[PDB]
Structure formats: C-alpha cells, structure tokens
Symmetry: C5
Subunit: 204 residues, 5 copies
C-alpha cells in the first residue's frame, strides 16, 4: 500500500519487457465498474493503456488506443470503439465505465463524454485477474507484444466496482476523486518489472 499522490509511472522506452503489475484482491466477478487514469504519450501507433486478463481469457478487460482520437474497450474479447477530437501529442485524462445489466460502456475524455456504445450485455467480467500497465497481455500475465507496448507516463489511476455518476467523474478529472475499492492510487499494490521509473507528475 504505497501512496503515489503526485507521482507517475514512466515507461521511458519501447520494449517487450518493461511493465508494471497491479495487484488487487477482488475475487468476486465484476458486474459494474469504472476505471480512470491520466496518460501522456507521443506514440502515433496503437498501444494498450490498461490490460486486465484472467486465467484462460485474453482481453477480459482492456483499454486500448487504436490511433489518435480513437479509444477502444474490450470486455471478454468483444470490442467497442469511440472517437473524440483531441490534440496530439497531449496529456489526457481517460475514464471508462461499463454496466453489465445494460451492456453500456461510456468513455469520458478530459471530462467530456464520448458516444455511449454497448457490448456483452449480461456478461460477468472474471475475477482474480492479472493487471498490467505498459504492455498488452496475450496470456495470463505475459506473452507481450512490443508493438502494442505503452511508452510514456501514467498516473492518478483509480478503479471502482460501481458506475460513477457524471458528478464523480468530474471530481476525478479535477484531481479530487472519491476513494476507490478496486485500485486506489493512494494505496496501490504494484510490482515493477523491467525499466519503469517513478517520477513526479509535472504535466497537470
């Protein structure tokens, strides 16, 4: 339980080895959830932001940037993509929620809502995951791909087991987030593997 307030992870080079493991207890399958964080990268190609796999299931929960201005969400291998107008390169605050009952996934880029899309209505996201920043898993905790690796900075990451209202998403964007029960940036359990450096956050 480490307090990373005002710090970021820095993945300072393209690689197939550098990454961070996020550790959560969880154990109960996910029905609703909201995830959010800040990222800053000048990659033009595609990259994984947040990779969440479980035993036997690739891309169980994956936030993945297709290209400038397109964000994709995977839920149990099914995919959904939404577009937004953004500058490049630029810092972004990404936030994504998904609700099993309706299947709706809303993206929120820099406090602006993208078009809602739907997938996997009725599905339950599997538990006891391996979660990875800086690489995209194609196995249970490994088999990475260099050309999907993330190069840049990530911080202010939070994950709740519910769907945040707009009022609460704004709070997170403005740096005063509600306390999170799946991943909290101020009490984070993480392993660093490879070349990842922790530095102060100087771009918000």
């Amino acid at each position: 339980h480490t307090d990373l307030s005002g710090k970021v992870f820095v993945f300072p080079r393209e690689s197939v080895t550098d990454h961070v493991n996020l550790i959560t207890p969880l154990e109960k399958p996910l029905q609703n959830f909201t995830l959010c964080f800040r990222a800053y990268s000048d990659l033009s190609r595609a990259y994984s932001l947040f990779s969440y796999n479980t035993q036997g299931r690739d891309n169980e929960l994956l936030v993945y940037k297709e290209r400038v201005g397109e964000y994709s969400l995977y839920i149990g291998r099914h995919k959904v993509t939404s577009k937004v107008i953004e500058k490049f390169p630029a810092p972004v605050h990404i936030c994504v929620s998904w609700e099993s009952s309706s299947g709706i996934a809303e993206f929120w880029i820099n406090g602006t809502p993208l078009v809602k899309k739907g997938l996997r209505q009725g599905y339950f996201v599997e538990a006891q995951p391996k979660i990875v920043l800086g690489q995209e898993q194609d196995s249970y905790g490994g088999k990475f791909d260099r050309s999907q690796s993330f190069v840049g900075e990530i911080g202010d990451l939070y994950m709740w087991d519910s769907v945040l209202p707009p009022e609460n998403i704004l709070s997170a964007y403005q740096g005063t987030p509600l306390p999170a029960n799946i991943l909290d940036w101020q009490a984070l359990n993480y392993e660093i593997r490879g070349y990842v450096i922790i530095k102060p956050l100087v771009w918000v």
Copy 2:
C-alpha cells in the same frame, strides 16, 4: 405517455434490427410542420435520423445525414440538401421545418439557420405514419438497411404541425421548447424493438 425529460435513446451498436417506433395519432395530412431533436454519433457514413413512412410511400418524410456537414430532407421521395460547418464528432441540435404553401424547408443546426431550399410546393404529407428512430424504412414500418442505421444517442425530440418562428426554435435549442402536438418528448408513445437502452442525457 412517458416523460423522457433528461433521458436519451441509446442505439449502442450497428445493426439491422435495433430501432424505436414512435406512435402518434395524427390522421390529418400534414401541411406545415417543424421537427427537432438532439443527436450524438461518431459515424462517418450516412445515416437516417428520423424516418417517417406511410402506407405505400417510402421516404414520405425523412431526415437523413449524408456525410459530415450535410443534412438532407426528403418530402414524398423528393430530396433537398443543405450544408453547414460542424466539428466531428460532436453533439448537434437539429431542427427542420417545411411549409407546403411555399415548399420551403429550413434547417437549423445548433440554432444557426442553413440556406433555405424548396421542394414539393403544394404537396400534402400523408397521414397515419409509421415513424422510426435508429433505422431507415424502405417499407411501411420495416425492410431496414444496416448501412443506413443510426448508432449513437437521440433525445429531446419534438414535432409540431406548424412552422416555428426563429424565437421558438431558439427556445427549443436552449432546452425550453413550446409544447408540441405531434410528438412530445415529455409525453411520448414509443415501442422499443431490439437493442436500445434508455439512459440519462449527459452531453448537454
């Protein structure tokens, strides 16, 4: 008669099956009319916003987006198109009126008037329609086309049997519309067919 204030329809995936039926009594043929609503979609291709058919007549009244920045109005199979400068993707408030006596159709995008165009002077729009959101009809209530389907969110839909003055169009754009006698968002009769979800409106 359901009050959808502050809610929207969400057509969360491309399909040939998802759609909403709007139900109005009407019965008397339409001479003048104003239609308006909000839409938010990141489709680059063409799509139907509002499809209104009658027994034996395709595209009797159809609002249809050709491509970014071009809105078309069909009246009795005749078509008229007007251009506007818009960002993309972005939420839009569309509003369109048509007057039989003059044949003039004015479009109003986000409270800005497009160039007036004319068609079907003297025509009477047929009554007892089937009205459909989220798909484009090529029959009396069906025979849809996937590549014309609407994917995104629609709300704040109103339809009057008269032509609104500018003062009243602004009112609708600003969220304080006059009460409507053909379709009112606050007392709406609708059927949902397929995958359509109702959610709160978070983008105005």
Copy 3:
C-alpha cells in the same frame, strides 16, 4: 414600390427558369456606381449574383462568383477578379463600386476591402437595362444558363449612381444604409418569374 425591409428573395432550387427582374428607370448612362447586397448560398460551383444587360450588350455589368473566395466584376464584357478569405458556406455582405474616370473597381466583403483592380477606364455603362437576380443573362433579359443560376437567399440590395466612401459602405454593412437612387430595397420594383419565395431574413 415595395418595402422589403427584413425580407429576402429565396431561390430554393437549381433551375433555368426561376428568377427576379429588377426594374429601374435610369435612362442616363452610368459613369460611377456602387452596388451592394447580402447573399447566402451553399453552392460550390460558379454562379451569377447580379446580372445587368442592355440591348445588344451581354455582361454589361455583372457580379459573378467564380468559386469559393473569388469575386469577379464584369464591366462591358471586360472582367476583373479579386480574392478574399471566407468561410463556407457562410452569409456574406458583398459591395462593389466602379469609377469610370479611373477605371477602378473596389470590392468590399463583409466590410473588408479587397485589392482594388481596374478595367474599362473611360467607358460608360449603358442605360435602360434589364436587371436579373437568380440567373445569368446571355441576352437582353433571357437566354439563361442553369449551371450559372443562383440558389440561396438574397436581400438588403441597394444601388447608387455614385461611389460610396468607406464610411458609407460600413453603414450599409451594419444595416443602416444611405438611401439609394438606382435600386432601393425599401422601395423596390420587381417581377418574380418562376419559383422564387419571399421570406423573412433570419441570418443576420
């Protein structure tokens, strides 16, 4: 003598038949003159705004839009073109003057002066004209061309037999023009031929 204050002509479709005839006494050949009006059209091709012909002389005085951002003035079949930065589609207030003694023609788009150009120094523009909005004449009052027709809205048209100073051109742009002695929008003699509708001006 009809007062069209706050109204516009609407040429609502492309055609070779719709047009308006403007009627002025004149009778004395034109030495100096200023013309101005508002127009709103989303045509990308070329079109005639103001066509003024006399017996035996085509394009005696013609204001003609070549393409987006280029305005041409014809004086006795001689042509002159000036460029400007404009958005599209957008409403414009055009104003053009010409002085025989110097041959100089200045264009003024939305109150901004274009580069001055010269032509026909010493020429006298012929009298007893047929003047036409919405079509381009290739005869004395007819032989139109569909692909030069104007589609959109025109209003606030004034024509003086002198050259307005800048102070007066601004006045016209801002909607408080000096009274005009060749064509006055507030006492206009006009015939409508074909499909032309008069509607209120809603875009200024």
Copy 4:
C-alpha cells in the same frame, strides 16, 4: 515633393508597362539602409515589390516576394530569403534593413522580426539609382518582365540611410514614422508611367 499621406499607388492590372519611377538625389554609395512600406496584393506568383538598379548593375537592391510567406532581399545580385507565417491574401507592412559592416539583413513583417540572414559583408550599394515600383528592372530603368510585375496597392514608403532600431520600426508600422532622408512618402518625387492610379488608403 508631393505629400501622399493617406494615399496609395494602385497598379490595377498585370502588365509590362505600368510602373512608377522613384527619384532620389543620393549620389553617395549606400553603406547602411532601412526601407519600409505597405503593400496589398492577391497575386499567388512571384513579384517585385521594390526594384533599385544602377548603371551596369542589375538587382543592386531588390525586395522580391518569392511566394506566399517568403521574402527575398537582393544586394548586388546576391540573394537572401526569409520565411514568415502570414494569411493570404492580406495587407502587409514590410520593413527591411541591411548593414554593410556585418552584412546582416533583417526583415520585419507587420512589426515581427524574421530570422536575420547575411550577405555581401563589406559591399557598398551603388549610387545614382533608378528606382521602380510595380515592375522588376533587368536594365538601367527598364527591360521589365510581365510575370514579375506587381499588381495591387503600395503606400507609406520610407527609406533611411541608416539602420533603424526596433523602437523606430514599430513607430513606422504604427503609422508615426521618423522622417526619412532617402525616400519620404510625405515629400516624394515620382513619375507615373502607364496605368497607375493614386487613391486613398482604405485598408489600414
């Protein structure tokens, strides 16, 4: 000695004949010098702004616009070019200085300094020149080229036999220039040859 305050030269058509001769005594070779003026033209091709030749020497001192956003200075046939961000077409206030001792030529477009460049260090610009607006000389006062001719308006022209500090360049840009000892717009000796008209300056 004519006062052209608030007036401009208008070169109203492309030609190989229209031009203005500027007349100065000078007689002593130029070591340092600053030149400046306003110009307004919608030509996309190359054109000469200011052409200064002497007996037996082409392009002794020549300010020449290569294309949109590139200004060239010739000093004794040697050339130097600097770039700037500008809108087009648009009025510009150009100002250029050159210092023999250092060879440095600074351009100042609309009160903004371009990158300094150098040429002809140690050179002395020849005296008893023929100076021409509106054409580019390839002889001592003539042998013009149509495709280098200037078409548009020029005014507020001043030339000093020293190098103005920044404070003084701003003054000239803002319309309150120091009195000039080589060419002064308020006491100018000029011949008009061909089609050149003097009109009031309406674009500053």
Copy 5:
C-alpha cells in the same frame, strides 16, 4: 568572461565553416545536467542546436532537431526523441535535462514539458569536451557537415551540473534564470570561427 545579456549569436548563412566554440573547465564527468537556450531558425531540414563531443566519442551530448516538432537528445551515441506541437517558423525556448541514476531525459519547450524518455541509465557523460554551436561535430572539435549546420539565432544559453526543478525551468524561460556553473550566458568563454555575428536579441 563576456556578458551577452540581451544579445544573440547570428549564424547568417548555411555553411560548413561558421561556428562558435564554447569553453568550459568541467574536468569532472557529468552525472546529472540541465541545458537551455533560445533559438530562432526557419530551416525545415534537420540541424544541430548544441554539439558536445569528447576525445574519441562522437555525439557524447547532442541536442538535435529532426524536423518541425521533433527534438532529439543524444547521450553517448544513444538517442531519444520527443514530439511537441509548435508553429513554424517560430522562436523557441528549449530546455533539456538528464539524470544518470534514472536515465530519464525531460524536454521542456517554451515552458511546456514533453513526454519523458530514458536512455543510458548509469552512464557518465565524459569530461573535457569541445562544445560547438552552429555545426554538428563528427570528430573532436571538427569534421562538420553542411546539411546539419544551424542557420539562425541562438541566445540565453545556460548549463547546470544538476537537474533543475520545474520552478527553475520556468524562471529561465521567463528570463530570470538561476546562475549556472557549466555555461553561463552572462560570463561566457567563447571563440567565434567563421561568419558569426553578435547582435541584440529582438525577438523576445
């Protein structure tokens, strides 16, 4: 020890000969360091800003502009590149730091931080350098390349043997920098070789 406050070096032409040697004692290998300066050039090709070589080691420390919007840092032949949105041509204030312990290099363009990148973790930058402005060294003080030469103006150069905090980088950008212990613009030891002129700084 010369005070260049409010002056710049001007490399006024492309060449393989013009350059400036910067002289520092140093002698102790560099572990951390921050470098910063202002530059103004309208070159579209690549150029070296700051070239620092040591006996037997090319590109030991090199700041090098790849193209518009891309800045590269070399540390012991290894390279790292970061992107930024900039206008062109435009004056820029560049500032770059590097820390051996972490290998992290941060760029700061006009007071804005680029994405951090990493290289040469653990490395020690060699001492007793030859440092050169206006050319890129491929030997110990020479063997230049014309097509990498810098053409424009450089000034306000400072270099510290530590890593400046953000607060101090802002100070340097705003013209009130902390005193520097490797290179100080207000006490600079430099040789000028070739065509380089010192002029006042007129573009900040």
